[PDB]
Design a protein around this ligand. Structure first.
Ligand SMILES: O=C(CCCOc1ccc(Cl)cc1)N[C@H]1CCOC1=O
Ligand SMILES: O=C(CCCOc1ccc(Cl)cc1)N[C@H]1CCOC1=O
Lengths: 251, 238
């Protein structure tokens, strides 16, 4: 996870609390759009971008999923697509979840020719330097990037730390609006062996009416049942009949 | 506003961690670090299907681990589920104390359950609620005891935490843009084609096409024609 920043006034702190809180409440796209609007107006810039993207193991982006963009100049867009800078952009090469990255700092250390060429072209349309924050969701190799272009965003150390802890909640909010399909565990086994044993564990039976029933005897029933109760994260078995109440219905 | 200074710190911490909960154990663990800043040791977290009416129809999953071991056995056996005046709350409407909602239940099956609860320590408590009307699914979070409710500062803390536990519960369990004619419009907008080359292909006058182009854009929340193209790229790829 990410550790909160400090050396934030309460306003700064209260504010951030505000953002995270609301973010937990975003569903429809309209919500997400406005929310960012209020964010990018306590922000030394008017050019933002929010994108989902599938991830690899080192948490690089390979393909982009969806973009819920904000302000980027629609000329730099046209050109970004046409020239297919997507490949030569040194920013899509970050490893996600490592927040946050300065455009300037990551532009003086790119040493390819296709890169140094993109970098220069960016520096004309204002994308010379900027900062981007990232969040990743390794359960599913999906990730978020959030960019703001400009030299001024990064000179605001307080606000950088705030946006950086907000990111991972924007990520959650993003996944929610774009209703991506699973992604499935898909679902935790009964499990097979457990269902026969849990199938009946819940109502009207003892370790013995079960072992005999499964031809495993009270003993096998006993060895197998507590794998269940610890599987279902339950201290008590009749507490395991309560938590694992749902499986014997959803299959 | 506010109030206290500290409390915000922990409250903020609770919401931050609850936005990170994926796995089931993560949820388990976290509810412990919550119920140990809590005047009680008997809670419980449950999802349930949400009807148009406030009262729940069926329980989906229970992901708790507090309630005793006897009161459970009995709650099931007697099927108190029906006459429990608590499952009758309407979700998403602040918190409601057990005591306050027990002196105002006036049925006999109810007054009978209420009394049986009062022997097993459930004679008083509190329950916060979160609902998700997009899908009629909702969360309850209970803590049993007279002491939880006498602590105003966290009552309000746990109350604002609830809706984030709700989100965390869903994810732990689950599992539950443009008109088609226009999409053809957009399908072309995206290949470089001008307003004209479209009238061309789908056989519609520019006024007819220049009209659709505007509609798709706002639908997507885009500034211009070349930023609606970008926002919506995920539409013609899936
Ligand atoms: O903001 C970013 C990263 C995201 C750019 O992704 C894309 C990819 C494809 C499309 Cl169509 C649009 C944006 N990069 C800054 C750095 C300099 O110029 C930029 O565009
Ligand atoms: O906390 C609740 C609602 C949740 C009770 O759900 C269940 C259902 C089944 C089981 Cl196994 C356990 C708890 N109800 C309070 C009100 C008085 O006594 C209670 O138990």
């Amino acid at each position: 996870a990410r550790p909160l920043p400090a050396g934030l006034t309460a306003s700064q702190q209260w504010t951030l609390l505000e953002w995270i809180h609301m973010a937990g409440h975003i569903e429809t796209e309209n919500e997400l759009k406005a929310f960012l609007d209020q964010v990018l107006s306590q922000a030394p810039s008017e050019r933002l971008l929010l994108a989902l993207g599938r991830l690899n193991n080192q948490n690089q982006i390979q393909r982009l999923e969806r973009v819920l963009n904000v302000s980027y100049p629609s000329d730099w867009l046209d050109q970004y697509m046409k020239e297919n800078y997507a490949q030569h952009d040194p920013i899509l090469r970050i490893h996600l979840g490592q927040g946050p990255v300065m455009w300037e700092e990551r532009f003086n250390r790119a040493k390819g020719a296709e890169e140094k060429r993109f970098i220069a072209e960016a520096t004309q349309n204002g994308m010379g330097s900027g900062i981007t924050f990232s969040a990743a969701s390794e359960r599913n190799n999906i990730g978020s990037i959030l960019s703001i272009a400009g030299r001024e965003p990064g000179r605001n150390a307080a606000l950088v730390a705030m946006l950086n802890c907000l990111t991972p909640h924007l990520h959650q909010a993003a996944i929610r609006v774009a209703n991506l399909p699973p992604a499935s565990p898909s679902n935790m086994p009964l499990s097979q062996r457990e269902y026969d044993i849990f199938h009946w564990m819940s109502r009207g039976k003892t370790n013995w009416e079960i072992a005999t029933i499964l031809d495993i005897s009270e003993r096998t029933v006993k060895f197998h049942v507590a794998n269940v109760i610890r599987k279902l994260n339950a201290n008590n078995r009749t507490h395991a009949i309560v938590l694992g109440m749902h499986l014997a219905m959803p299959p």
